[PDB]
Short mmCIF file of C-alpha atoms in Angstrom, two decimals:
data_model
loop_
_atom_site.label_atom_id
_atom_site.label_comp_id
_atom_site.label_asym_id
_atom_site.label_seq_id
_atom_site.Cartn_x
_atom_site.Cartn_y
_atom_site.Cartn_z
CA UNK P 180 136.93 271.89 121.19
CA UNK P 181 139.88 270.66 123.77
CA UNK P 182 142.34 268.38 123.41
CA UNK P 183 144.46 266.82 126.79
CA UNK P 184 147.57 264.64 126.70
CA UNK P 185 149.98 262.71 128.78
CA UNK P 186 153.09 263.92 128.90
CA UNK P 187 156.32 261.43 129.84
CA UNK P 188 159.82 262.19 131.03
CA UNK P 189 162.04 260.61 128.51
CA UNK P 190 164.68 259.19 131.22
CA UNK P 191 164.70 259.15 135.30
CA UNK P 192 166.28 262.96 135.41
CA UNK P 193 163.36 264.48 133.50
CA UNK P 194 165.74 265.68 131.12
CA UNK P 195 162.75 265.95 128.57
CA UNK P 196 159.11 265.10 128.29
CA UNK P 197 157.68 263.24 125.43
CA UNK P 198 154.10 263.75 124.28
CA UNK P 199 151.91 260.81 121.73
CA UNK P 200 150.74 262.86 118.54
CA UNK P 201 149.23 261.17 115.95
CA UNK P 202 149.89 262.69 112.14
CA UNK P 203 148.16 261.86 108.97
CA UNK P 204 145.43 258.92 107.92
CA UNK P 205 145.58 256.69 109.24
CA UNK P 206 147.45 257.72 112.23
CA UNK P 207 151.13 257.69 112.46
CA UNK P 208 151.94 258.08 116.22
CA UNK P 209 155.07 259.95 116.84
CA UNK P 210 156.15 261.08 120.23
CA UNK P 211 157.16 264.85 120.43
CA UNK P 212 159.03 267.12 122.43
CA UNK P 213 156.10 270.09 123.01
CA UNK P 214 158.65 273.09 123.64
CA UNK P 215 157.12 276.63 124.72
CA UNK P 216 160.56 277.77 123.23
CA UNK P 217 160.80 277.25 119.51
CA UNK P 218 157.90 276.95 116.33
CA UNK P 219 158.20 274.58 114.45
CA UNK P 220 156.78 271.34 114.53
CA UNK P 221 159.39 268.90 112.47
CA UNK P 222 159.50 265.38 112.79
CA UNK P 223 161.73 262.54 111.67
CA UNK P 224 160.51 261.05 108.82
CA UNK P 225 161.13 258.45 105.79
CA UNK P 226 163.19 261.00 103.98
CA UNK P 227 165.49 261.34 107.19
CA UNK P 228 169.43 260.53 106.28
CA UNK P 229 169.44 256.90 107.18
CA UNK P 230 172.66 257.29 109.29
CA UNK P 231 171.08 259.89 111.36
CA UNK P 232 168.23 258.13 112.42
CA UNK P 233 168.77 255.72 115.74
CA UNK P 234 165.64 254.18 116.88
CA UNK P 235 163.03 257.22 116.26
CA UNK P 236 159.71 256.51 115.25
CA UNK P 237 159.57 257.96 111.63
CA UNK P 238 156.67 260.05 109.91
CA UNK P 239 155.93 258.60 106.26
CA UNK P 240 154.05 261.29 104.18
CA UNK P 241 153.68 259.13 101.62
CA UNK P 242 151.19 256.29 103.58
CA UNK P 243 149.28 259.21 104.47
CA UNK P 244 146.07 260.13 102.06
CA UNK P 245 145.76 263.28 103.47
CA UNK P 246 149.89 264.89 103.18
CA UNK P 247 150.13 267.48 100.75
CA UNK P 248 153.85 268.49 99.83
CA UNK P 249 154.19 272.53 100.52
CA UNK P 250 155.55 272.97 97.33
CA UNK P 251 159.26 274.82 97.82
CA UNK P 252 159.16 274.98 101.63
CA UNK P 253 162.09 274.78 103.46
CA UNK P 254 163.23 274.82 107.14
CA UNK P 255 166.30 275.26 108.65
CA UNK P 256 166.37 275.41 112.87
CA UNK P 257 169.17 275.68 115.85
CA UNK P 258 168.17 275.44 119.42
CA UNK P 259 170.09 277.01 122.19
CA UNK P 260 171.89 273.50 122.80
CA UNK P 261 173.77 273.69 119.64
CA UNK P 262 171.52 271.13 118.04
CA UNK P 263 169.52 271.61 114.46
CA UNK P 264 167.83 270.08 111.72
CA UNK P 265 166.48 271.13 108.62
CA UNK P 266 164.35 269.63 105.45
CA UNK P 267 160.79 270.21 103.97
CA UNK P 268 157.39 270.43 104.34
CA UNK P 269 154.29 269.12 104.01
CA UNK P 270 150.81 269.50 105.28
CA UNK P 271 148.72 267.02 107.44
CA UNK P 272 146.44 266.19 109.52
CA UNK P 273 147.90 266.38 113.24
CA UNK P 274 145.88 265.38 116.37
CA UNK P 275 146.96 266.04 120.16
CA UNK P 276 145.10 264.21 122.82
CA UNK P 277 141.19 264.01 120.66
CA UNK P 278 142.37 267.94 119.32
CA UNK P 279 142.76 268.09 115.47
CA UNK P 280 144.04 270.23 113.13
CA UNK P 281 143.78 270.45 109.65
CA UNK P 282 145.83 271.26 107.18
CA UNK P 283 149.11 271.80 109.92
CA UNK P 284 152.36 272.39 108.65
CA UNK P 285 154.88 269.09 109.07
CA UNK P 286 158.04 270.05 108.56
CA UNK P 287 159.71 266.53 107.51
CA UNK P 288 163.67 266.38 108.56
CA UNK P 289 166.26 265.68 105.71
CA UNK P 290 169.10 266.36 108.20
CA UNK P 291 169.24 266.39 111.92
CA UNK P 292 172.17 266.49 114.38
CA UNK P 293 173.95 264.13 116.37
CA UNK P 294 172.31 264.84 119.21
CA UNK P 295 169.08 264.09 117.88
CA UNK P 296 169.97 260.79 116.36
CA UNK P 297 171.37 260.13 119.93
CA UNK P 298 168.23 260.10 121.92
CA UNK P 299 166.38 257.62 120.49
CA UNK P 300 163.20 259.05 122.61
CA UNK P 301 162.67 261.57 120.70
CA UNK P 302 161.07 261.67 117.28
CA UNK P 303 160.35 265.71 116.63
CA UNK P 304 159.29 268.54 118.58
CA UNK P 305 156.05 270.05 118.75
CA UNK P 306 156.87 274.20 118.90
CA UNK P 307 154.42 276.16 120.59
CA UNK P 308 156.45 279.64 120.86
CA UNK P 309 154.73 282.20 118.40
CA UNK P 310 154.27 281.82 114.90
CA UNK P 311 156.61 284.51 114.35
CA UNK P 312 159.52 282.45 114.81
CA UNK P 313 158.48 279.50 112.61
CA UNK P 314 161.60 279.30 109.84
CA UNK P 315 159.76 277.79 107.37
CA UNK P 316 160.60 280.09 104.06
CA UNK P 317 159.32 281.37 102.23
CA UNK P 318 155.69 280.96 103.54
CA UNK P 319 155.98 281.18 107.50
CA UNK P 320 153.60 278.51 109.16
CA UNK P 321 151.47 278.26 112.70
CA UNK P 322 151.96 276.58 114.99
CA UNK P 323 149.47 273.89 115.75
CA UNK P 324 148.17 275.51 118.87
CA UNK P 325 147.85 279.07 116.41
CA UNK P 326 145.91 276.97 114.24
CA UNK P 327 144.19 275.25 117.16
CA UNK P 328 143.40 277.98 118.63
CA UNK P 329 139.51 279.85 117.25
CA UNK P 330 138.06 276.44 117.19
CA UNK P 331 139.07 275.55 121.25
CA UNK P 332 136.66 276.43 123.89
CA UNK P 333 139.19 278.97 125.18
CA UNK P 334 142.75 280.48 123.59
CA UNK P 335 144.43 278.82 125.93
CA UNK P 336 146.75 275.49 126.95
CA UNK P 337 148.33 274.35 129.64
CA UNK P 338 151.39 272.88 130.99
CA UNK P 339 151.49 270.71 133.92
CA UNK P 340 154.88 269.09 134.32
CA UNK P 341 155.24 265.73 136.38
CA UNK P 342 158.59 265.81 138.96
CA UNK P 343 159.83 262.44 137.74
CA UNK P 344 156.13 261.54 136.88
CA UNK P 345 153.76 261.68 133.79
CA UNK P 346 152.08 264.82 133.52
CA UNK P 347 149.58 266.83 131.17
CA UNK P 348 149.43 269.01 128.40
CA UNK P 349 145.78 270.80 127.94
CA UNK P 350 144.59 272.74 125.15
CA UNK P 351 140.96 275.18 125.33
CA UNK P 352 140.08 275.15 128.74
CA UNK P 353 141.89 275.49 132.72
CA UNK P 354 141.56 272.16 134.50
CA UNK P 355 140.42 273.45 137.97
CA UNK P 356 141.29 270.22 139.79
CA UNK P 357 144.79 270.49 138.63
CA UNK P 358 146.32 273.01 140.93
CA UNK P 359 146.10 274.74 144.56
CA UNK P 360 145.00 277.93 145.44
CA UNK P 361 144.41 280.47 142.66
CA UNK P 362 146.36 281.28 139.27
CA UNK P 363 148.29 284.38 138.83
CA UNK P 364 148.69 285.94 135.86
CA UNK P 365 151.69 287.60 134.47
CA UNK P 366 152.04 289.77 131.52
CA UNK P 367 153.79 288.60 128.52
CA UNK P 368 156.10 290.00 125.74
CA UNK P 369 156.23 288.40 121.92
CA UNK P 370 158.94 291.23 120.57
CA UNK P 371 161.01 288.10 121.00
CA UNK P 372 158.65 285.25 119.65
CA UNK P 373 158.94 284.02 123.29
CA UNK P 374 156.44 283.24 126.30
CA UNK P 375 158.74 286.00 128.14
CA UNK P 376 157.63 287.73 131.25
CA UNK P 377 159.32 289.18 134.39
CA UNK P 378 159.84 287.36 137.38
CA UNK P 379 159.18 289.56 140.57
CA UNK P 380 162.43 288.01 142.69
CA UNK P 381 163.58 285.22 144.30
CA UNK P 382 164.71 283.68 147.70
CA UNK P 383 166.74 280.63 148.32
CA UNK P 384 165.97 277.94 150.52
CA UNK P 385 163.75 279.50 154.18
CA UNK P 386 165.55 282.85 153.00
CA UNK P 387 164.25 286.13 152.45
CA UNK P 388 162.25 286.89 149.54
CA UNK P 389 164.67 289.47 146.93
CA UNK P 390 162.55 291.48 145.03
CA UNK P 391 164.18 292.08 141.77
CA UNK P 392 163.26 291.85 138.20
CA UNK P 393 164.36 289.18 136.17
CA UNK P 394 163.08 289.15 132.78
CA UNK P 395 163.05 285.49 131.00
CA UNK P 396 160.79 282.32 129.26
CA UNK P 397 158.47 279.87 129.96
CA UNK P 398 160.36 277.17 127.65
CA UNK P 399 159.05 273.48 128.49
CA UNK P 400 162.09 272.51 125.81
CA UNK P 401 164.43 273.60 128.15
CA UNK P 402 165.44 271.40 131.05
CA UNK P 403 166.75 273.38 133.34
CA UNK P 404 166.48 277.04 134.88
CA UNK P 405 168.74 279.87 133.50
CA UNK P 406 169.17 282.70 135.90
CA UNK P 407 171.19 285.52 136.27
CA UNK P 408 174.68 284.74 137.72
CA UNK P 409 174.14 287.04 140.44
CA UNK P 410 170.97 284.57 141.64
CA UNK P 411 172.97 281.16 140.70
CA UNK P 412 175.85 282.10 142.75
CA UNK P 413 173.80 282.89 145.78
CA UNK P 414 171.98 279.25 145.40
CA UNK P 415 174.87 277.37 145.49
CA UNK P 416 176.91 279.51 148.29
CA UNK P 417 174.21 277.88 150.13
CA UNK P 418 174.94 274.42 149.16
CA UNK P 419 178.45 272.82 151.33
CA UNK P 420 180.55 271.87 148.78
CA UNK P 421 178.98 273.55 145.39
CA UNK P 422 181.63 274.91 142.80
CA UNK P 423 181.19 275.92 139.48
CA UNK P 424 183.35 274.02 136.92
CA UNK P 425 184.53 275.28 133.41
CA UNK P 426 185.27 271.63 132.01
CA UNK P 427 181.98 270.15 133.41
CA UNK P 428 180.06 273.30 132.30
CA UNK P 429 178.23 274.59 135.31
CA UNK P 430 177.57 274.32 138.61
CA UNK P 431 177.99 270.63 140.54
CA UNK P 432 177.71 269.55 143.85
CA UNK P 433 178.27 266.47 146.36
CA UNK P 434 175.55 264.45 145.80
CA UNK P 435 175.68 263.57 149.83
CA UNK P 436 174.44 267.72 150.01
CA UNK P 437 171.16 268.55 150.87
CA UNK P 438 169.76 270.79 147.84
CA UNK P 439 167.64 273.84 149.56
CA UNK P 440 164.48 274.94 147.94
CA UNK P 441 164.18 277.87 145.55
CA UNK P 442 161.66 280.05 145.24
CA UNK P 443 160.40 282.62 142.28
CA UNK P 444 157.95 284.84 142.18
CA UNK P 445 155.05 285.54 139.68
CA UNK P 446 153.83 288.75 140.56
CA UNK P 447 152.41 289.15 144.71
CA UNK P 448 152.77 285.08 144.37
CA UNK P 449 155.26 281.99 144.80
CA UNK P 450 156.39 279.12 143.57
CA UNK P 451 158.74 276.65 145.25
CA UNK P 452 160.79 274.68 143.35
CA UNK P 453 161.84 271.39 145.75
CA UNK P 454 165.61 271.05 146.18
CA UNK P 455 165.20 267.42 145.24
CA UNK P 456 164.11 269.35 141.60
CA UNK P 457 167.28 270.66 141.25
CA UNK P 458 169.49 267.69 141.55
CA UNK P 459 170.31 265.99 138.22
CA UNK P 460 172.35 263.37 139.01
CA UNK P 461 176.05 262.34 138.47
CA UNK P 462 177.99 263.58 136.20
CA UNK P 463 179.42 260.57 134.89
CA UNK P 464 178.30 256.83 135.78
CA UNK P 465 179.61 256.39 139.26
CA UNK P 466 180.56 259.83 139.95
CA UNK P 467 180.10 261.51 143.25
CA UNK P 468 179.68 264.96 141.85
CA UNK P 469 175.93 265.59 141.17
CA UNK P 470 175.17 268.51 138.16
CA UNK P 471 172.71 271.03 139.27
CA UNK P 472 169.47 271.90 137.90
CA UNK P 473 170.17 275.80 138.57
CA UNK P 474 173.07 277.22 136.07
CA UNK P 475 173.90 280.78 134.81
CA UNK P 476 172.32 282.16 131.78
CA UNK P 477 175.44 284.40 130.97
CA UNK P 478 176.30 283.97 127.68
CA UNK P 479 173.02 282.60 126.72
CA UNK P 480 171.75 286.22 126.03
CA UNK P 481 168.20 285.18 128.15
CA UNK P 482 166.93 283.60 131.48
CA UNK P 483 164.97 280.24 130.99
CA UNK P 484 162.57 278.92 133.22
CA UNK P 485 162.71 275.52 132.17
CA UNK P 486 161.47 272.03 133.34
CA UNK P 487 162.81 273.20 136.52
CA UNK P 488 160.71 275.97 137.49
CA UNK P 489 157.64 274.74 135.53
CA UNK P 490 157.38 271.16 136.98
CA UNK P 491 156.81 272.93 140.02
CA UNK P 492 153.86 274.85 138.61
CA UNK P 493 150.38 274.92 136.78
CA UNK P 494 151.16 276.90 133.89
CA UNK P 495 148.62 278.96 131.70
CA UNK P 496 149.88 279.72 128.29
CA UNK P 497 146.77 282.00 127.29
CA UNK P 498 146.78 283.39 123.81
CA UNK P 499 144.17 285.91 124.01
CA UNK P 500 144.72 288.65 122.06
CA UNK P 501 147.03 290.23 124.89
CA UNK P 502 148.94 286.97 125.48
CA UNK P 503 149.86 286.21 129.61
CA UNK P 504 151.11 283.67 131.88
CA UNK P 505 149.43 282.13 134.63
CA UNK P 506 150.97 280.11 137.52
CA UNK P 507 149.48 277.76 140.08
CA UNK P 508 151.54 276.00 142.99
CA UNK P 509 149.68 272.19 142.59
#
C-alpha cells in the first residue's frame, strides 16, 4: 500500500504545515501537525476543556463505530516550545492520504496549553519520531507510520515541504518526479527516539564550504533551524545590521537586508537553503526588525533542522531495519 497527502502552511511565514487525516467511521477530518520530532498522535477532541478549545476541529470518539477506549491509558507530552497536553486514549481507525491503519492509537486531549488553544489551525499532531518516545503509559503505542509500515510497498515516507506553498507527505514508495539529481543517504541514530544524523558542514551565502560535524534532527514540527552558536553567529555577521536580542529571543535583522543563502551538507552533497527561507517577518505588526529563521540551539540541548532546512529538500525518512535519511535538492 501508499498513502500521499497535501500538506499546507498554516499562515504566510510557514510557521507550520497542516495535513487532512481522517479518524474513525465515518470519517472525522482533522487537520494535523505531522512532526518528525515527537510520537504521539493526540488530537482535540469532545472531551477537550471547553475553555481551551478556540476554533479546532474536534475528534468525537463517541460518533465513531469503530473507537475502542484503551482502557487506563494515559498521556502526558511537552514539546521543546514549552507547550503540552495530556488526556486518554482510544483506538481508531486513522487514514492519511487513501493509507489506513487499523486499530491506531488516538490519544484524545483532556488538557492542552494556551498555545494550542491559540492557533486555531491546528487540531493535533501526527508524531512520526520512533515509537520509543510515545508517552502513552502504561502500554507504549506506534506510531501510525510504525503501524503503517509492513503493509506499505516500501518502509519508507517522505517529506516534501512547500516554501510558502502546499507540499506533500508520502508514505511506501520515493516519488522520482519530486526532486533533482540523486538522493543521498545519511545514517541515522534512534538512542534518542529522534531522526538524528550528522551534518557534514556548512557555508554561508557564495562562501566556502566548513567541514565540520554537527550532529542534530530532521523535525518537520519544528519551524526553524537550530545550529550551533558558533554557525549562527557567522550567518548573521554576514547580514548588515543583524544583532541578537535577549528580549526578542534571537537573532533579528532589518528587513531592508538582503538574507544570503545557507548551505548544509548531507554527506559529499548540498542543500541550499534560499535567504528568502530564512526571513520570518516582523517582529511585531509594523515593525522594521525582521526575526530570522536561523537561531542558536544553546540551551536547547540539540540542533534542529526544521522547516527551514527541510523545505529546501526531498527528504527520505526510511525505516528499514537500519533507519537513514535521504536528501534531494528539488
Amino acid at each position: 500500500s501508499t498513502g500521499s497527502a497535501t500538506t499546507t502552511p498554516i499562515d504566510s511565514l510557514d510557521d507550520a504545515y497542516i495535513t487532512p487525516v481522517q479518524i474513525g467511521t465515518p470519517a472525522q477530518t482533522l487537520n494535523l501537525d505531522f512532526d518528525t520530532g515527537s510520537s504521539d498522535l493526540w488530537v482535540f477532541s469532545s472531551e477537550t476543556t471547553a475553555s481551551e478549545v478556540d476554533g479546532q476541529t474536534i475528534y468525537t470518539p463517541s460518533k465513531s463505530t469503530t473507537a475502542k477506549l484503551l482502557s487506563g491509558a494515559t498521556w502526558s507530552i511537552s514539546y521543546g516550545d514549552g507547550s503540552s497536553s495530556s488526556g486518554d486514549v482510544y483506538t481508531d481507525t486513522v487514514s492519511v492520504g487513501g493509507l489506513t491503519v487499523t486499530g491506531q492509537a488516538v490519544e484524545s486531549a483532556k488538557k492542552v496549553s494556551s498555545s494550542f488553544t491559540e492557533d486555531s489551525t491546528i487540531d493535533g499532531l501526527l508524531g512520526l519520531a520512533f515509537s520509543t518516545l510515545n508517552t502513552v503509559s502504561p502500554t507504549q503505542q506506534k506510531t501510525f507510520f510504525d503501524n503503517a509500515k509492513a503493509s506499505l510497498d516500501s518502509p519508507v515516507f517522505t517529506a516534501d515541504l512547500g516554501y510558502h506553498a502546499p507540499g506533500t507527505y508520502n508514505f511506501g514508495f520515493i516519488d522520482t518526479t519530486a526532486y533533482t539529481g540523486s538522493i543521498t543517504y545519511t545514517a541515522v541514530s534512534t538512542k534518542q527516539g529522534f531522526w538524528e544524523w550528522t551534518s557534514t558542514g556548512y557555508a554561508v551565502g557564495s562562501g566556502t564550504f566548513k567541514s565540520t560535524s554537527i550532529d542534530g534532527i530532521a523535525d518537520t514540527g519544528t519551524t526553524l533551524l537550530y545550529l550551533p552558536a558558533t554557525v549562527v553567529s557567522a550567518y548573521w555577521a554576514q547580514v548588515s545590521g543583524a544583532k541578537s536580542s535577549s528580549s526578542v529571543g534571537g537573532y533579528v535583522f532589518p528587513c531592508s537586508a538582503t538574507l544570503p543563502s545557507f548551505t548544509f551538507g548531507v554527506g559529499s552533497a548540498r542543500i541550499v537553503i534560499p535567504g528568502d527561507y530564512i526571513d520570518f517577518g516582523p517582529i511585531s505588526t509594523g515593525s522594521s526588525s525582521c526575526f530570522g529563521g536561523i537561531q542558536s540551539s544553546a540551551g536547547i540541548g540539540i540542533n534542529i533542522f526544521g522547516d527551514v532546512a527541510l523545505k529546501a529538500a526531498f527528504v527520505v525518512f526510511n525505516g528499514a531495519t537500519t533507519p537513514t535519511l535521504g536528501f534531494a535538492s528539488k
